[PDB]
Amino acid sequence: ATGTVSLTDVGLDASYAGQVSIGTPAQDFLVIMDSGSSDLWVAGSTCTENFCKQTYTFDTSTSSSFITSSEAFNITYGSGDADGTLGTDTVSMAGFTVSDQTFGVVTSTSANLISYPLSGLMGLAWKSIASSGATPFWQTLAASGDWDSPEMGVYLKRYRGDNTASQIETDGGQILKGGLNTSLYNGSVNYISIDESEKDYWRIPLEAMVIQGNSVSIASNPSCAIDTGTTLIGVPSQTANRIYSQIAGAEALSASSGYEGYYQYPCDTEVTVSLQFGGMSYSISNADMNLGSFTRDTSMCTGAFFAMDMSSRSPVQWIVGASFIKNVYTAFRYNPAAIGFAELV
Amino acid sequence: XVVXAX
Ligand SMILES: *[C@@H]1O[C@H](CO)[C@@H](O[C@@H]2O[C@H](CO)[C@@H](O)[C@H](O)[C@H]2NC(C)=O)[C@H](O)[C@H]1NC(C)=O
Ligand code: NA
Secondary structure: OEEEEOOOOEEEOOOEEEEEEEOOOOOEEEEEEEEOOOOOEEEEEOOOHHHHHHHHHHHHOOOOOOOEEEEEEEEEEEEEEEEEEEEEEEEEEEEEEEEEEEEEEEEEEEEOOOOOOOOOOOOOEOOHHOOOOOHHHHHHHHOOOOEEEEOEEEOOOOOOOOOOOOOOOOOEEEEEEOOOOOOEEEEEEEEEEEEOOOOOOEEOOOOOOEEEEEEEOOEEEEEEEEEOOOOOOOOOOOHHHHHHHOOOOOEEOOOOOOOOOEEEOOOOOOOOOEEEEEEEEEEEEEHHEEOOOOOOOEEEEEEEEEEEEOOOOOOOEEEEEEHHHOOOEEEEEEOOOOEEEEOOO | OOEEEO
């Protein structure tokens, strides 16, 4: 079978969310579709944080199929952490169901992790990085032979650069579970193979980067999480410095600014930039690259590449988020494990 | 921006 998840684009391409249904009877939530993590969680109805009072929460007491656990749940993301306990219940998405899906019932987070209209997150990466130790929903479906083709197809719609865009755009893209949507891409899919040691994040090697016509030293090539739940493109500090050195007038934001790790450059410079994956260059549009002015200096605009130094325990050195992914149709293939890119239709 | 695990 196949099934489609309609995406809502939140925060001007900040996050892309889909509908999950949990429990009996079904309780529905908008959750961030996150190819850079592997746990499902939702805010629980007992959660007393402010964001919980302002969004939809999961009431464990009114699901007849909920199986409680005392087991702690906690997960750490780049943007903060989420804590609570594990539970097990029936979960549906895209017309599919996993009957005894283990997931987090979250009752605290760091400030501003999520808010209305979101209630949680669905991890789309591999079991080995699931904090819960549970098989991800998608991975159960792929493994069970339920899909026409063992892959997920992803289209993230762009609102950055639309000056009349809203903070909630319900026409935000699509994830097709069990195939690729041929109306959304043109030509052939270029698959970059993922070996059996790399099934954690969805990650592939960066072959090269070109910015303003200059090939950047990306030094030993980085493994890149292709991450639908990251807004921008996170790279090592030394690499970010090299990137912005290719744009005339670019500078690091000070730290006093509140924007340490970000870089700004002349707003009237259109930046030509591409990343090379699997022997092909994939351009990033200027509407994705230019984030606008972060300070009162309106002549300077922030770039989509930011400095983020990774733990030396991390198998990824780049996090390649929506800023990139908006420019390609993306296939996350279970078997043979691969990430594919195609030109958008 | 957000940056989704560690
Ligand atoms: C693949 O993408 C197309 C384009 O978004 C989808 O087309 C929409 O499908 C619904 C019914 O499912 C129609 O009522 C809409 O009018 C279509 N939109 C457009 C712009 O044509 C299509 O559903 C997707 N196919 C699959 C299998 O997921
Ligand atoms: Na509802």
